């Protein structure tokens, strides 16, 4: 376990995981708030 | 011991021959624990005595009341009457439940801790002199048939109990397959054995798929899926 979590902290896996999380977040934001051209508040 | 259940079988280590009627059986290793061995001897004694009572009941009823099938003799329509109280299986079960509960809790507390519930609850001076578990004696042996060879008579009782247990299994299967009484079955097979054997008679369930008891529906069964 400790070594498995160390493996999950490696740059190859953590980078890929973070890119996946940020990509998913942008995809969700664009799915619910689409076609937003300006910061209309 | 001496002779075992099978000719060349090897008696187990724990089956020395101390307990009565022990023929070096137990091929399933169930009595390898002395605690469970005592429990199972008590259970065998109870089952054997109750089976003696049941088989005696079947035979005596069927010779005295031949027109009544023992299997269905518990249905309320078949109940012999003594006074004018309306029939009610719920009512009858209250007596049996409560009384059997008392007597069986007494027996249970004997089993749990031997020689602990031998005296009357009301007169703590009348005690039962039970030499062993499952053999209380005293009032339960009022005619005094003990005192003599206790081990020989213990073997008598236990071997008759095993015989009656297998005989009641026989009675249940014969009733469910044939639908007739036990001695009726014997007289039946004595006439045309070639067509009145366990063959043909097996595979048929002479039991209704359910019964109704004054509005209560019981699903019944057969012990084997034979229909």
């Amino acid at each position: 376990m400790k070594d498995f979590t160390t493996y999950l902290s490696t740059a190859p896996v953590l980078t890929l995981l973070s890119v996946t999380v940020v990509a998913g977040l942008l995809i969700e934001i664009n799915r619910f708030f689409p076609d937003a051209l300006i910061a209309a508040f | 011991q001496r002779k075992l259940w099978f000719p060349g079988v090897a008696a187990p280590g724990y089956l020395d021959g101390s307990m009565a009627g022990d023929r070096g059986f137990d091929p399933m290793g169930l009595g390898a624990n002395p605690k469970m061995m005592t429990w199972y001897r008590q259970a065998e004694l109870q089952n054997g005595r109750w089976a003696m009572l049941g088989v005696a009941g079947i035979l005596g009823q069927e010779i005295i009341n031949p027109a009544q099938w023992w299997y269905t003799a518990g249905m309320p329509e078949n109940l012999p009457r003594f006074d004018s109280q309306p029939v009610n299986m719920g009512g009858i079960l209250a007596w049996e439940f409560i009384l059997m509960h008392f007597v069986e809790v007494r027996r249970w507390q004997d089993i749990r801790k031997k020689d602990s519930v031998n005296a009357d609850p009301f007169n703590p001076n009348l005690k039962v002199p039970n030499p062993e578990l499952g053999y209380p004696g005293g009032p339960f042996d009022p005619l005094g048939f003990s005192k003599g060879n206790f081990k020989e008579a213990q073997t008598k009782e236990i071997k008759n109990g095993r015989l009656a247990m297998v005989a009641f299994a026989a009675f249940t299967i014969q009733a469910q397959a044939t639908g007739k009484g036990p001695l009726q079955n014997l007289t039946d097979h004595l006439s045309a054995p070639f067509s009145n054997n366990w063959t043909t008679n097996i595979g048929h369930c002479m039991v209704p798929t359910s019964v109704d008891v004054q509005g209560l529906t019981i699903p019944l069964s057969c012990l084997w899926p034979g229909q």
Partner: protein, 231 residues
Amino acid sequence: ARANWLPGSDFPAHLENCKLPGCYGFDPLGLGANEERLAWFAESERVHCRWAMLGVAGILVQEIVKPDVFWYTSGATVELPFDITGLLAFELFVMHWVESRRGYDIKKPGSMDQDPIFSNFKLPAHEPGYPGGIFAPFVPGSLEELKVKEIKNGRLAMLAFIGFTMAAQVTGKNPLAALREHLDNPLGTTIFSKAVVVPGQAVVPPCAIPDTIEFQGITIPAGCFLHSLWP
């Protein structure tokens, strides 16, 4: 050897050498294992015994004198000399006073023993839950034997009151009425006749007390304890 709840059994450990009256070595669940909790539970048992004695005696007498009133429903069908709101408030205040005093007395023994109004009047020193003095004018017999008698009667009274409630739920009539109903046909009035379950069918008795009741406009959700869970 001694008096046992199950002849032939042994006592646990806390219940061995009791000073509480009625110690027959019960507690099959170990609630009195602790020793503060044991005293608290002893006081709880005593007050339950006494309240249930009063309850069962009141129900029996009220049934004897006014057979046309159902004890269960009698709370709403009795015609009060006062109102129901102020009556409950008076109840609340008086019972708060007396019950708080008793509870504190149990908590710390040498406490709630002095009359507030009159300084000179004061309860003589007593064991918890047995005040005595003004509370015990006449004492018919030895105190320990009478404590045992009270405990036995209280056990029987609590069982009897739960039976009262249940018969009222399933039979719908007052206790002695239910006894007369059972005595004309003992085979047929027992719960084994009224209810029964088998794999494939369940026969349960209906609840005579209705789902709701009407009282001065509002409805009190007075059903039948827990239906469907009846056998």
